[PDB]
Amino acid sequence: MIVLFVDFDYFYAQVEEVLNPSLKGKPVVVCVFSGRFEDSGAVATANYEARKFGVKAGIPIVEAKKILPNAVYLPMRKEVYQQVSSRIMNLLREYSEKIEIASIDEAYLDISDKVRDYREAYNLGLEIKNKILEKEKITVTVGISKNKVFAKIAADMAKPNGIKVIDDEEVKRLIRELDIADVPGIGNITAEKLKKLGINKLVDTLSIEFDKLKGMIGEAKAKYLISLARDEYNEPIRTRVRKSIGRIVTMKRNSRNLEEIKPYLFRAIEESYYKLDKRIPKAIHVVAVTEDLDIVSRGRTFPHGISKETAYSESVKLLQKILEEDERKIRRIGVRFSKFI
DNA sequence: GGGGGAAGGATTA
DNA sequence: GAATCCTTCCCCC
Ligand SMILES: *[C@H]1c2c(cc3ccc4cccc5ccc2c3c45)[C@@H](O)[C@H](O)[C@@H]1O
Numbered sequence: 125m126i127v128l129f130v131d132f133d134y135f136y137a138q139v140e141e142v143l144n145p146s147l148k149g150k151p152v153v154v155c156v157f158s159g160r161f162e163d164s165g166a167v168a169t170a171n172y173e174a175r176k177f178g179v180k181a182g183i184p185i186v187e188a189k190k191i192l193p194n195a196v197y198l199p200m201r202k203e204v205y206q207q208v209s210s211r212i213m214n215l216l217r218e219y220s221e222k223i224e225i226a227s228i229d230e231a232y233l234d235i236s237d238k239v240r241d242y243r244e245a246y247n248l249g250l251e252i253k254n255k256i257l258e259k260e261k262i263t264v265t266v267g268i269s270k271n272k273v274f275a276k277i278a279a280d281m282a283k284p285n286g287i288k289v290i291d292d293e294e295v296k297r298l299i300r301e302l303d304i305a306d307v308p309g310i311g312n313i314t315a316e317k318l319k320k321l322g323i324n325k326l327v328d329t330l331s332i333e334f335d336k337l338k339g340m341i342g343e344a345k346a347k348y349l350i351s352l353a354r355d356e357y358n359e360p361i362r363t364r365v366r367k368s369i370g371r372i373v374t375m376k377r378n379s380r381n382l383e384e385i386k387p388y389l390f391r392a393i394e395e396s397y398y399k400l401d402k403r404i405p406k407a408i409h410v411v412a413v414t415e416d417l418d419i420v421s422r423g424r425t426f427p428h429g430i431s432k433e434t435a436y437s438e439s440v441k442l443l444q445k446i447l448e449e450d451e452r453k454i455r456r457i458g459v460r461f462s463k464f465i
Numbered sequence: 466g467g468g469g470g471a472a473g474g475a476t477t478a
Numbered sequence: 479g480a481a482t483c484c485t486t487c488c489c490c491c
Pocket residue numbers: 477478479480
């Protein structure tokens with residue numbers, strides 16, 4: 125299997141740079157202004173000019189303005205990015221039927237039946253970068269290797285506007301030398317447990333009692349890392365099927381008053397139902413973000429599809445169960461639908 | 466024992 | 479911006 129992964133560079137920010145060329149060169153920051161006060165909210169992403177100074181995805185807008193008070197701050201325009209993303213994804217389908225769209229700006233192509241070696245794969249990578257640059261003027265980074273994980277790692281090492289191949293030999297080298305925290309799917313919580321077990325490389329997972337690893341990070345995570353360590357990871361590139369769809373809305377002020385929360389809840393339902401677009405869910409979950417930012421959720425699965433009216437009455441029951449079983453004030457209230465027919 | 470499915474919390478980019 | 483993962487609990491052959 126030969127996998128080719130594409131990751132659009134600082135995507136949201138780059139799309140804004142494309143719709144407004146004067147932004148190129150300056151530091152650009154795309155935000156999600158929450159609506160609580162003056163500049164409440166967080167940074168969704170920033171271009172490299174801004175990242176040079178520590179302004180990156182995740183930090184509060186307030187902090188970003190203390191680092192770069194003069195950068196360009198743009199409100200996120202998700203619909204526009206999604207549209208551009210759809211177009212670029214269509215460019216990608218002309219290079220392979222087997223394609224896995226992982227997120228708004230990441231996709232995996234199984235090009236095993238299109239190239240004979242990594243040299244041909246690397247050239248197809250350039251072709252793709254050129255085509256996207258030609259049609260949409262967006263630079264992306266290509267990663268290529270024997271499987272999805274290494275193709276992704278390959279792109280992480282080469283971004284921005286890069287391209288890299290990780291042949292079978294370098295895979296073996298990385299299995300011994302790559303910091304295990306840089307492996308896709310290993311986030312902080314998992315990385316800290318591996319450090320506290322003396323595991324810093326994938327290879328280290330081969331010399332520990334399985335049950336001890338499975339006990340600290342879970343069976344799936346353990347089998348996953350072990351299979352990568354043994355150079356036996358080969359998950360196929362499959363089509364992604366959206367499994368849940370929802371919306372959560374931040375309330376004007378945190379509350380525990382059902383009648384005060386209702387309007388927001390119902391808004392989340394209306395939005396979600398639109399997003400569903402012809403999809404009929406059998407399951408619904410009301411999701412609450414408490415004042416201390418913890419997440420409490422209550423759901424229900426029906427034996428038939430949920431109609432909007434049913435979603436209305438059921439979400440209220442579910443909201444009370446949350447209010448009943450938890451005493452904290454609610455900050456954000458939302459809904460999530462799943463188990464489509 | 467384990468296939469099968471529902472539910473809630475954990476974890477991730 | 480949200481979505482999937484993972485672990486536990488339980489019906490039933
Ligand atoms: C948006 C938000 C937040 C946390 C996460 C955590 C992990 C994610 C993995 C993949 C996609 C994704 C999209 C939005 C996310 C994610 C992820 C919150 O910190 C934030 O409040 C928003 O909900």
